[PDB]
C-alpha cells in the first residue's frame, strides 16, 4: 500500500475549465493562448486514459454548479479525479467570467466526507492562474 | 475508528508560488501548462507524479523568462508550487 490503486475500470474524469473571455467590469483582458493549453491538456490526459470534459467561459456560478454536479456522480469505478482551472486569479481565488470564487469552495465538494466515491483516491487540482501581483526578478546562476 | 482526514488525498499543482503572477505566452500557451504536458508525455509511463512535477518545476524555472517593452514586466521568472496532501505514490500506469 505504498502506491494508489490505479487499476480500477476507469482512470477517472479530467474536467478542464477554460476561461478566456471575461465581462468588462472585471477589467480582465482576453486570455490569449489559453485554447492552446486546453487542447494540449485534453490530448495529454486522453493518452493517460482519462475521460476528458472541456468547458469554456463559465461564470462563477456555473463553475460551482459544475463542480457540485461532478462531485455528486458515482466515482466508484474510477481510480482518481482531475480538474484543471485555466483563468485569471488571486491568492486562493479563481475567476469565473463574471467574478471571483474561492478555490476552497470548489475543492470542498470533493472532501473525503462529501464525495464518498472518491474517499482514499487521489484528487488532483491543476491551477493555471495568478496568485497575486508579485514579480520574480530571478537571480543569475 | 479507522478514519482518514477529510483533507487527505488532495494534490494542488499551482502554476506559480503564493502571491505571484503566473506567465502565459499568447502564442504557445502558459509556461506551466505547456511544461506540465511535455513532462507528462515524456515521463508518465515511468516516473511517480511528484517527480514528474519536480521536472515541471525545473523546466519552468530554467527555460522561461518574460520579454516586455514595459521594463516593469521584463525579464521575469516563475517557479510552480506543488502542494501535496497525498498519502501514497501516484503512477499513471498499471502493472
Amino acid at each position: 500500500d505504498n502506491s494508489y490503486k490505479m487499476d480500477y475500470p476507469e482512470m477517472g474524469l479530467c474536467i478542464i475549465i477554460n476561461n478566456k473571455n471575461f465581462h468588462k467590469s472585471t477589467g480582465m483582458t482576453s486570455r490569449s493562448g489559453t485554447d492552446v493549453d486546453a487542447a494540449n491538456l485534453r490530448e495529454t490526459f486522453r493518452n493517460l486514459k482519462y475521460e476528458v470534459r472541456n468547458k469554456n467561459d463559465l461564470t462563477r456560478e456555473e463553475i460551482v454548479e459544475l463542480m457540485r454536479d461532478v462531485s455528486k456522480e458515482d466515482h466508484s469505478k474510477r481510480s482518481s479525479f482531475v480538474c484543471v482551472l485555466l483563468s485569471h486569479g488571486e491568492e486562493g481565488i479563481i475567476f469565473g467570467t463574471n467574478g471571483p470564487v474561492d478555490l476552497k469552495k470548489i475543492t470542498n465538494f470533493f472532501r473525503g466526507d462529501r464525495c464518498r466515491s472518491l474517499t482514499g483516491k487521489p484528487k488532483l487540482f491543476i491551477i493555471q492562474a495568478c496568485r497575486g501581483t508579485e514579480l520574480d526578478c530571478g537571480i543569475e546562476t | 475508528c479507522h478514519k482518514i482526514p477529510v483533507e487527505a488525498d488532495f494534490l494542488y499543482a499551482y502554476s506559480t508560488a503564493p502571491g505571484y503572477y503566473s506567465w502565459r505566452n499568447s502564442k504557445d500557451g502558459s509556461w506551466f501548462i505547456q511544461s506540465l504536458c511535455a513532462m507528462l508525455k515524456q515521463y508518465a509511463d515511468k516516473l511517480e507524479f511528484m517527480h514528474i512535477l519536480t521536472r515541471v518545476n525545473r523546466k519552468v524555472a530554467t527555460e522561461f523568462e518574460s520579454f516586455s517593452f514595459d521594463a516593469t514586466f521584463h525579464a521575469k521568472k516563475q517557479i510552480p508550487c506543488i502542494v501535496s496532501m497525498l498519502t501514497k505514490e501516484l503512477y499513471f500506469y498499471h502493472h
Binding site: 486570455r31 | 503572477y21 506567465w23 502565459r24 505566452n25 499568447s26
Partner: peptide, 4 residues
Amino acid sequence: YVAX
C-alpha cells in the same frame, strides 16, 4: 508575454 502576458501575466495571469
